[PDB]
Design a protein around this nucleic acid. Structure first.
Lengths: 100, 59, 87, 58
RNA sequence: GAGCUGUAAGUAAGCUUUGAUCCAGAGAUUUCCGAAUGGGGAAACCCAGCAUGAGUUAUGUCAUGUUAUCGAUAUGUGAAUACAUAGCAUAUCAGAAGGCACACCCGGAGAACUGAAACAUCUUAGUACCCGGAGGAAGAGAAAGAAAAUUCGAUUCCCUUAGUAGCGGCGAGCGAAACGGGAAGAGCCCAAACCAACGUUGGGGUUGUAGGACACUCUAGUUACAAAGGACGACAUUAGACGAAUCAUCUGGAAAGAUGAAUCAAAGAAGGUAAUAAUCCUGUAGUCGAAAAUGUUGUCUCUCUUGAGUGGAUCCUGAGUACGACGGAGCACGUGAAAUUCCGUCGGAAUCUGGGAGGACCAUCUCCUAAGGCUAAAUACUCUCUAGUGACCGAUAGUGAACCAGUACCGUGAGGGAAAGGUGAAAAGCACCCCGGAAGGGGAGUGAAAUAGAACCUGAAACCGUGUGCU
RNA sequence: UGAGUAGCGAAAGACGGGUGAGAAUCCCGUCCACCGAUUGACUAAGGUUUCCAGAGGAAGGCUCGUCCGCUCUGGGUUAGUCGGGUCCUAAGCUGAGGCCGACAGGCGUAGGCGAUGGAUAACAGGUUGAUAUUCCUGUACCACCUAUAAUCGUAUCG
């Protein structure tokens, strides 16, 4: 379950392949925001005095079913698990016992 | 309605058939009578049926 | 105690009332004797008289859903001494 | 939570909160002197938190 | 276990790894109206009496509790009637009321249109509406029974008998039971004689293979009926947690498709993801989980508590009752040759050699003991709650209602009653330039697509136009 | 379709100057005409924000509209004496106890309620974009309360 702050890799979409870091999250709607992917060029500030000096381009939310969590050793996307080795739960990798 | 103090004698209901067997609801009341009976507390005017009144009653 | 809710700062409550005539907006189930006591305990003044009037709810937003605003109760205190009821 | 004090102190606190931080912070939201408007909810909740504790003692 | 202040965008101002928001159990608070109950009233309002308390020199003004009617039970108890039988005065009690599931279930009162090809008997129908009383079920229930064999053994429900026996302007039509095969399986307490005591109380005693009192001798708990109040261990609901296995390349705006290689399966149900996925995400098979509350059911406690044969010398075994006469209702049964059950009215029995029944009635023979009461399971239904299914609907359909609908509105009132879904994968919802007072356009941009521009998918016919080849 | 057809709901307007993208219709001025036991001034029922100021011109207005009883954003009603309640009752409604009745309920005694009537203390001026016997200025008058009083005290209130 992708949390804000970690490194991911796109699995599907126009930017298949690229890798970034998660800067936001819409958990009620399952949307993460990845730096670099899904750039939308927008017409902003019809009247509002910024002043309008062009076009502000930002990211766009993507569905959390399109990113995967890379393995800290082989540089490979994978799934996750919960070993429960600490009194608190712990997230571990799948293609290896190492952690995230 | 009126009802007998000692026993619940009450009005019934039925037909009043004619010789050509036509029907019409009527009522059959009870023979109640105002009498004063000697209830331990007081003698108070109550209704008692004229059949209850036979075979003795404190009047 | 605190029966008052909020002062009223509008035209006709700004100058010709400015002098010894302060408008307050109070609770809808109090009499005028109670306001003559709450104003003296909160501000430490001497009150000459109090008048009161009630307003009826209005129709609010014609567009979309329709509805009524609240009913309010407007009081007016006159000071025989002192000043500074609102700043 | 701010109700760690003894019984008399608790009785004073409620008057202190409601007679200063609620009445005064609403003669400014009306005339237009108040900013940092989130102070109102905090005062309102504190009084609720106080009474709830007083009552439990009964 | 990392974001958050709902729908609902904005805008500020802030809380949070020192455990927010969120989900479950237990508490606290809970203005006013309403059975509404201090008195009144055009519900959501007005006016008060007593008891303390806050407050000013003082009254006016606030706060908190309390004060309806009927019923019971103590109390004082002071009409006429001298003692005294009303009435009155004060106290006590999670005492009663009022809603709601227009579904099912007992009882009281009770139609008509219709059918007979008219109609009066009859039928529809003991149906609808109205009223009262309950319960989660209700009613029924432990033989004064059913029968005709060498007998059965309390009620209810379903099959079958049987559209049979009957009934009837013997017309239209109505319409059984026993037996037999099965579901389920509980049977027991009072009155009376008699024994003491001061009309009442405790013991005794409960019935057809005749029982008991009387007389001599002597010998298990079923708190759902039966007498009933409490502590008492593990299952189950009320939030959750782990949970197997995939890569590459074409055509695309986008792969889950096509083409090649592999892999899990007590898991190939299903829904989503930029197009059609067992292996991307929530899940499923299977295992694990409870502070606190509530339900079911167990082993100890507990509390109750004596069981059987012989003797009729003798007294007991439900009275204005059973039954009869007249008038009605109900039994499948329209008064008939009408037994068996109930109501109104007036007459009125016997006591074990007694009394009732076996379709008028009388003798013989069989069966059974009325006039007191209780009682679980098999059965009926759904306002609801959790989990699911369908050769059921897909916006004129399906609930009146997928769209803030019992509403907009229509009526003095009871009452009636609509219409209205879809941009895109993602708002990326058209910066700037020009004509115009604006609305609306023409470019330029966003996007895979603007003839997808919020009067947003597709966009038929009626109908309204513009141009044109033959006439 | 009928079809650019019937109708546009009794009545006298003319001109000048402004405003404006736009004027027979909006604002100001002069003249003319109409009502005047009323088309004038007050109030009851009823309606329920229609009242006022600055903005607006898609819809509504039987035409147009720069305007409005229409749309948006802010305003407006003040009581010891006025009208009702803390006073009194007609007629009617209700009704503890009580009488009658298959249920449901019907009647009604005391005593409540209830005006359209009976009682009961104020007037003239000033002012605002919108309130005035209500706000301010001047002069009153009524019930209640504590203080002190000439005079008391078998007076005194019932």
């Amino acid at each position: 379950h992708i949390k804000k702050g970690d490194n991911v890799k796109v699995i599907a979409g126009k930017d298949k392949g690229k890798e970034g870091k998660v800067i936001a999250t819409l958990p009620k709607k399952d949307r993460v925001v990845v730096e670099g992917v899904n750039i939308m060029k927008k017409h902003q500030k019809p009247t509002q005095l910024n002043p309008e000096s062009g076009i502000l381009e930002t990211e766009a939310a993507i569905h959390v079913s399109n990113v995967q969590l890379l393995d800290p050793k082989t540089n490979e996307p994978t799934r996750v698990g919960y070993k429960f080795v600490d009194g608190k739960k712990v997230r571990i990798a799948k293609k290896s016992g190492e952690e995230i | 309605g009126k009802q007998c103090f000692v026993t619940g004698r009450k009005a019934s209901t039925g037909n009043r058939r004619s010789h050509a067997l036509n029907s019409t609801k009527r009522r059959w009341n009870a023979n109640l009578q105002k009498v004063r009976i000697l209830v331990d507390g007081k003698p108070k005017k109550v209704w008692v049926s004229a059949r209850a009144l036979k075979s003795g009653k404190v009047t | 105690r605190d029966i008052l809710k909020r002062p009223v700062i509008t035209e006709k409550s700004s100058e010709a009332m400015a002098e010894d005539k302060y408008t307050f907006d109070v609770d809808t189930r109090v009499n005028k004797t109670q306001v003559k006591m709450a104003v003296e305990e909160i501000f430490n003044v001497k009150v000459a008289s109090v008048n009161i009037m009630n307003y009826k709810p209005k129709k609010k937003r014609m567009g979309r859903y329709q509805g009524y605003t609240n009913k309010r109760r407007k009081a007016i205190v006159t000071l025989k001494e002192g000043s500074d009821d609102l700043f | 939570k701010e109700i760690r004090n003894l019984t008399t102190s608790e009785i004073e606190e409620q008057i202190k909160s409601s007679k200063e931080e609620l009445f005064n912070l609403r003669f400014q939201l009306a005339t237009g002197q108040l900013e940092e408007t989130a102070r109102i909810r905090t005062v309102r909740k504190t009084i609720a938190r106080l009474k709830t504790v007083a009552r439990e003692r009964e």
